[model samples]
Target: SNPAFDMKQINALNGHYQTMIDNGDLQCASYMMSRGGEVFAAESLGEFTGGQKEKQTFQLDTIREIGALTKVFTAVAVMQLVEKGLLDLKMPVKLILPAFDKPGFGEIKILHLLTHTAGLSFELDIQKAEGIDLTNEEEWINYLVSTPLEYGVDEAWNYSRTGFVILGIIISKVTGVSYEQYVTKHIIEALGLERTYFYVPDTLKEEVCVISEHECVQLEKSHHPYFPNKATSGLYSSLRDIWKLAEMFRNKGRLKDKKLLGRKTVEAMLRNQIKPGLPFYFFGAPREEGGFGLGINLWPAGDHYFMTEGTFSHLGMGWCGMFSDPAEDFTYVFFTPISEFHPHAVLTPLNIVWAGIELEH
Candidate 1:
């Protein structure tokens, strides 16, 4: 059975976001949370400029770029192909993309990309005295093999954006459709998510918060004729749509009558897939002791971490985040762009949600 939330603390959680908005730390934000598949808390705060040039109250349906959170969708898409016998986790990258048949990439597997154990970099430099056109397939492969691996394959863990991009490319290659179309068909539309998009339409463009202007601009440029389709990032979604995603995971890959993913695959995704004590690095700092699942972020051993044990989660580039706690029987999704990008923006709200949970008698 689901436990009740302490309304006092939940109210305080609402106040906390209100305070952040009041202090001008955020132009707008929205969050949706559930316990045992039932939503108990959902809200939107702050004001934003709409298409009419008039400020309007933001709603839970307001859309924004979810950044690296897109990786989870890509991963799920890959798993779907695996379930259909069209793909395999252990498949070598060289098989599908022959350009990767060289030394470093020859040994790389699909699993390595999903787990961020492929020893790739967070990103490639866009400009240099000597440069390769990343959007060009031959140049992309040349640059990757030419550059030194951050570490040997499976030797360690690095939060590699390049890794997921490769996974997306593989997905595109395997499905014979654009990565965005494949995901939209199999996952987004299948889940009945009407508001989520790789490219937000012109009509709904005004619903995006002002703070995410940069991300939206990049998303537009990503559609340019010169740039190849990007799978590492560039997803725009609303709080309600994301909550629906959280529900599917909480339900262990099923939504109502549909089994979106196999029970075994869902279980595998929530479990840690990496060896202990391998080095971990995000954007700025290197940390040890944490682990990763297929596309979920696992909490490291110790009490200092905010989420409980068995809580699998992930965060986007500073703005979006979600976690599902099998133990706590809750799933939380946070979407918003703050004054600046930082982990605390998500962590603080997460901590407050934990406090709001009813204690065992």
Candidate 2:
């Protein structure tokens, strides 16, 4: 029996995707969907190389930088420690990293950082911070410790990369392993995801890669190796591997019977942890359908059809990543190397794609 989607809807989707490609709205794209380990739909559109359609069809193996999506992984790792009773969410961050005990950051809690309400300003000038190499954990930590907080902890919610960078540092201190190694060993390896990586090594750069034209041109020119703050951004992965991650979440952290984390833990990770009545905002879009969870985004007060109430999602610039309706058993993952002039231009289409899909009743 063919388990694929209705050909009519699938064809419409392919046509919609093709129109985007024909108009140059997307550079390269791929997607996958599964219901309890059974893949029902998978497709690819556009060219890997801008002008070379004959070169290759963007395959599942082609890895692209998954920017802020890295936060979900870092959050999961930290929460895993919390699950083991090795960490406390409400505890002052200073308890974990004494350096945070200094004057500006005294009352910040791990939960505040995880929920992005730590009140830390995103003001660190990576270009001006001398000797602060991102690959060096110590250097990053020093930069974070010295930076001043913009507001008192819990007073406001400001999306911050610095906060997550600090959380990444705390994760390393508590786990005795690099954040990359911790995620690789515990999440990637256990989930059997073979294509995800924190940093692309020189030797394996050719296998599957998407170089960001946006990063090359829009961001300042620099020779330093691009190092993403793990809690903020810095994941390299393929479409297929990311879909596997979605599958894990869609199935309540269970992959075929082996549970990576407790179902309650997964539920808690998706619950609304942000302040009441404030819609979660990202890339200037008021998240009409979602709220911030511990490390993910929860769409709590939206219509189930437009966005299920229990659904959780997150986005990565130049790479659109979303996992939704875990309780309803559906997930959506999308990626592209194109950087939209307006961030909402990149995301609004993704939401349309989700809205276009007909969920199984």
Candidate 3:
């Protein structure tokens, strides 16, 4: 059901696609690039060891943990509330949830969390910060809160898993339902992304793609310090599903007549919210040419750049690709079953790796 195009006409496409696979630099993967909703090219590639090391096919539906890409969704939910006047980006997080009495809590605003400027860091080893065997969520927050800020609020940008987790908590507090439930009700169900979920149920387990750090190095589950049930990490999704989501954003947060968000809100999400001249990093590499909007990464012209200027993206962990350029009326969405530091790091303005199509620009 992929849209139509010609792969051979893409001009020396194999140098980009075939080289990666032939060298084993990639694994079970899928790639698709489209203009608007019309898919010019779509392809599923590679195979991998599955249950009991059985050989398995990697198709478009094969799902894997999207890692921090989940934060983008969390940010959208925050903006939804903002549009309703129920939330304010500049408002202090402490005001929203009075229970948080952590260090520097007063200065941490909702904007800080969305942009990872909340003076927060990623998840830490609670065993070192607290102690051993703490089962309670309240105890978890206390130990996590016990840490000090590495940067002052709005001082700098540090990609933070911690910040978004807190955002999820705030979403729960405002909605009077768990973050999972609220997102499922408002976004997932609303978008009709039936294949997307926080986890795979028993019946659909076989359809899920298994991800690894290297050569099937099984991604394991660990106990979270807080918000155990609701999550966006390791999102199980299909290329088709993610494209619709990206297309929605491309259309300025709408699908046909149904309004997913106000156009102004989408502009805010795309606007560069971070301070000028702040350093950005991707997969531990120095990205001298990147800026962060509210919840998405903005790529402008320069070196180490996979996107065009003004394009928005959220590159996922667990080998998922999330890129979109609304101005180009373009998006490139891909998935893989294993994650390395920079898998598919570059694609030669990128084409032909897909088993799909071609067009003359």
Candidate 4:
């Protein structure tokens, strides 16, 4: 059953959130709530950019870039294909993408790529170099493939954008459709997410899209100069649309009268695919309390809280966020231009949103 909360609690949350915004702690904030197909509340706050201080109005259709959060969507799409028997988790990745069969990566399996346990190092130097477009998949893959493997696949958990780029390529090969098209037909369109698209298509460029702010990163220019990897981090969506996605996960892959995936399929997608006792590490910490399943991050550490140990979430560049707590029967989505690297990004108004939820019943 879904948890319940009172208007008094909700209003208190609103007040606290407003105070945070007034203090310049957050550039913008938004949230959505649903229970049994009924939307309880959907709200927005603040501006598109911190400098502009533009007040965001309530609109369910406005679109925003959902950075790395795209990984979870790609993961879900992959799981759907898995249910159709088009792919296998344990199969060697080389079988799907023969290019990976070369010297350093011959032993890597699909699971390693999915769980980010493939001992691949991030392209820190390449990302910093000139003329290297981070947007192009082919270029990124070529660069990644040329590098020597730092460790064997599944030896340790290392967060590599290159790993996801490889998975994106595999998806394209297996489906014979661009990653964007497959996701559109199977996930976005299926869910009636009209506002979601892999990229800011020419027609939508004039529309209200949040310009995410990042410190030291030149977001205006293409991050990937040569090839666009739509599957990795190219998605654009709205808070409400993402909430719909979240609510579907909270309800075990069902939305309204539609079941995008069977219960068992969703369960498998959430299962921890990483080997137990593996020296799991990402962003410098042993995310030992968590593991990757397909494209989603499962919080094994939160298991003691009566939450689904399989609770899945993904954050994108600190600008967009999605989280689904199946055990709590709730999902939350927040979109803002605040860069993840910003010291105050999560400290002010965003923290209020989190604190408000905790204060609720």
Candidate 5:
């Protein structure tokens, strides 16, 4: 049976997000909280006109960019390949992709990349180089191979988009298909996710949510070739599709008769892959009391703000967030397109969910 939650606290969420909308803190947002595979609280608010034919309130079917949350998908793709005996955790990335075959990179393994312990930069500096084309994946790979390692392999945990980009490349090389295509076929199709896409098609374009009030026109340009799937970000999904993915993990890799990933692999992916107390830096700021595992964030035993100690989560550019608590069998996901109010994106919903918890299962 599904665990119980205080209906009073759950009902307060709609008012909470509506207040954020009234205060101009958001353009549109969608969120859902659940326990034991059952969603208890879910909401979406504010007006969006990015891909819509007319202004409309963001709701259940709205698709939005998930940004860094794409990393979790990449991690799952890697683990799926591992389960098939096509990849190994200890295998050097250099073996699969020639980009990492250079000196100082030979020691880095696929495992290091998954755990953000591969000593790669948070983001390749070449991305900021003037006159450089962001769509040139080769150039990005070249710059990555030539860059210096930020830390020794397994010496420290540093969040690395570059590492995940390499992982996407590895996935592509191993599977003989584009990384985007592989994920679409294996994860999306396998899980029956109809609304998720790396490229939001023209027919469903009207359903996409505009992130900011001023930048509505940039929605179409956010697709491949312009905003190519770097494996670190660039995917659009609705609340329902994301919830199924999270539930599959929360259910230990099985959803009904379909086994998306091995149960042991899922456990390993969710477990903390770094030593306790290791500082993980992103954009020069340290992450709070958590460690990364595979591609997901692990909030192990700690003084958490709202989530249980054993929660695994991933957030995307303050536009999206997902947390699945294995201990409590709880799941929460929030998505929105906002401008300057990114910090409170995940915390607000998390606080609202935990404050209303009336029982633990």
Candidate 6:
């Protein structure tokens, strides 16, 4: 029999959600939990607004942008290529994208790019660089190469957009396929995530949960064949499709006989890659030499973070967070299409929600 959910816990979560929305911590929130190979609980609460659809309820199928969480998907795809020997993380940027053999881009290994150790900074407004024809693949590539890396490769760890943009270019160069095509074919489609999209296709309009506010807009597909910003930030998905990802990682990259990534690769991806003694911050709060995986961050044990120790997770714009803890065989993916933007209001309820999850023993 499936585990019995804590109704009292659910009521508390609902109360917390009510307080969050009332306090303006978020505009809309959708949450899901999967453990012991079953979806134990799913719920959503708060506010959402859009053209023709304002002030309404959100359901399990609701889709919204999952900011840097998209990077985890891209990171996994890069590992797939590594597993196939199509690419090597140790390979230099020049070897993969010959045009990037310039001063800022040269000498950087693919691993540095994925782990944010390349010293490349987030060079541009990652959300759809406007006015320029980002649709033209070559034009956007030129724009990125023009910007110089602030620090030498491997000198330090700084979050970078251009680094992953470089990865997208490498993915395209090696496979002779558009970066989106490679990722969609390998990750999104392979996982059978009909609700998850790298760029929301026009046909799937009805299913999308539009987050319309001056603070944010839903991630859109580039009119051009390759969008340079896609690798760093751009993804829209529902709770249902995303948990499959959590389940995959929890099972060491296997979901019912279909393998998206290798077991060892999953471990390496989850293993903290951040250099010890280096300073890092979670949402700008300085913590002790803390955690980061390839595409996610780890909540260290005993510090009492939002999730448990060994919990690796990612968050994005629009106040979205997704995390998984294989040690506890638990996964949580929550999306809130809100741009009102307050940290404490969001973080407090999140901890309460985590407390509510009763994983199988």
How close is every model to the real structure, measured as TM-score?
0.91, 0.85, 0.85, 0.82, 0.91, 0.87
lDDT string for model 6 (280-302, tens) is 43333444666777776675433
Candidate 4 collision pairs: 133-224, 133-225, 134-223, 134-224, 135-223, 135-224, 136-224, 136-227
Q: For candidate 3, write residues 30-116 as lDDT tens digits.
A: 777786568776667677654456657877777666666677778778899898888999888878766455668778999988887
Poorest lDDT segment (10 consecutive residues) of candidate 6: 215-224
Error of 3 at 259 (Å): 2.8
Range of the 10 consecutive residues with the lowest summed lDDT in candidate 1: 219-228
Q: Which candidate gets the maximum TM-score versus the true structure?
A: 1
Error of 6 at 267 (Å): 1.0
lDDT of 4 by residue, 1-361 (tens): 1245344556655665566567866555666665444667667776654234354553456677776888777877777878888888777878986667788787887777778877877533455435766456555555666678868876887877667777777788789987778888889989888788765556765455454433212233434433456566767788878888877776778887867888787777777787777776667656554666766777532533333455677777746667666654656666655544552453233333333343224
Model 3 / residue 185 / CA error / Å: 1.1
Question: Which pairs clash in model 3?
Answer: 65-234, 66-234, 66-235
Q: State the TM-score for model 3.
A: 0.85
Q: Give per-residue CA lDDT, model 5, range 66-178, as digits (tens).
A: 77888888998999999999999999988876777788898899999999888887876644555756556676666666678888787777887778878888898889998
lDDT of 1: 0.77
Ten contiguous residues minimizing lDDT sum, candidate 3: 213-222
Worst 10 residues of 5 by lDDT: 221-230
Whole-model Cα lDDT per candidate?
Answer: 0.77, 0.68, 0.67, 0.66, 0.77, 0.71
lDDT of 3 at 239: 84
The TM-score that candidate 4 achieves is 0.82
Model 5 Cα displacement at 235 (Å)? 0.5
User: lDDT per residue, candidate 2, 225-297, as tens digits?
Assistant: 4343455776778777777777777776887855678888888887778776543444334446347788787
- lDDT, model 3, position 149: 69
